[PDB]
Ligand binder design. Structure first.
Ligand SMILES: C=CC(=O)N1CCCN(c2cc(NCCC(=O)O)nc(-c3ccccn3)n2)CC1
Ligand SMILES: [Mn+2]
Length: 298
């Protein structure tokens, strides 16, 4: 009986507030930093077109076994062929059309399978595809793809993830002499509990497809989550550094909540932004075939 965590804040900025992402995130910060994650719905007219080279988009997804940690004790696809596989998997698993499966049912079934010792569900995830390989999901004035006059406002938009500031201030940067990543998801494909490198911000955009479910923990409960992890994670991974342990830190949010860790959830739909604040532990899974883009900013 999985209990859905409370909903994270959702913001619907007007066209005035939507003029600058960094200004908007700083003003919603007093609330969103207390929940770890937040969702931002752009104005209804803001619809960036999909600019990925779909004709050339090929990738080999990684294999995910949902119950790999509880059990302790691949084809190359195009975007079309992966989606046909993703839709056939979900429609066969739930025995109904893909768009008719309630998001609460996929959520309850995902967490049952993760801890299931009898059912071994295996899915695939097109994870960590660089935007340099086939182009960003957003229009970019890089001269390698045709940008129409109606699309130029999106190539120059501050909410275009390619236009987010990524350079961190340091003395090393002045003594010296990032790009968004793409995620093609299917039903039950997931990412486990982790924080971004250098406790960085991260913004995620779902270009199209089925929703992506998120779980977020505010930064003021980061040490409590890490303590709960060490107490409940397998002992063979107890001594591993964070950069490696984060690869195998899948945990039911109700287990964290039972130990007093505040967890917030949300369903990121197509065309919606999710922002993760510094040192906000987050995890989640995809409701079905979708396409997401994410970048770290500061
Ligand atoms: C956390 C490890 C993890 O579960 N995986 C599998 C899932 C895909 N992938 C991801 C995904 C992700 N965010 C989800 C975005 C989305 O899927 O839309 N963040 C990272 C990451 C890794 C190191 C440092 C910072 N971030 N890696 C690779 C490792
Ligand atoms: Mn990440």
């Amino acid at each position: 009986e999985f209990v859905p965590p409370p909903e994270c804040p959702v913001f619907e900025p007007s066209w005035e507030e939507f003029t600058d992402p960094l200004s908007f995130i700083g003003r919603i910060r007093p609330l969103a930093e207390k929940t770890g994650i937040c969702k931002i719905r752009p104005p209804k007219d803001w619809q960036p077109p999909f600019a990925c080279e779909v004709k050339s988009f090929r990738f080999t997804p990684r294999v995910q076994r949902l119950n790999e940690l509880e059990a302790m004790t691949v084809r190359e696809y195009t975007l079309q062929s992966f989606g046909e596989m993703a839709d056939n998997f979900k429609s066969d698993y739930f025995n109904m059309p893909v768009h008719m499966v309630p998001t609460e049912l996929v959520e309850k079934e995902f967490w049952r399978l993760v801890s299931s010792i009898e059912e071994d569900v295996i899915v695939e995830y097109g994870a960590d595809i660089s935007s340099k390989d086939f182009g960003s999901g957003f229009p970019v004035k890089d001269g390698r793809r045709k940008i129409l006059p109606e699309e130029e406002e999106y190539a120059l938009s501050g909410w275009n993830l390619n236009n987010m500031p990524v350079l961190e201030q340091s003395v090393l940067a002045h003594i010296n002499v990032k790009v968004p990543w793409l995620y093609v998801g299917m039903c039950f494909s997931s990412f486990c509990w982790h924080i971004e490198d250098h406790w960085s911000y991260s913004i995620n955009y779902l270009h199209w497809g089925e929703p992506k479910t998120w779980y977020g923990v505010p930064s003021h409960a980061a040490e409590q989550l890490e303590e709960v992890m060490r107490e409940l994670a397998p002992e063979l991974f107890e001594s591993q550094p964070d950069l490696l342990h984060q690869l195998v830190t899948i945990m039911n949010p109700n287990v964290l909540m039972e130990h007093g860790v505040p967890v917030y959830r949300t369903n990121q739909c197509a065309g919606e932004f999710v922002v993760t604040f510094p040192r906000a532990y987050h995890s989640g899974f995809n409701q079905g075939y979708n396409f997401a883009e994410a970048v770290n900013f500061c």
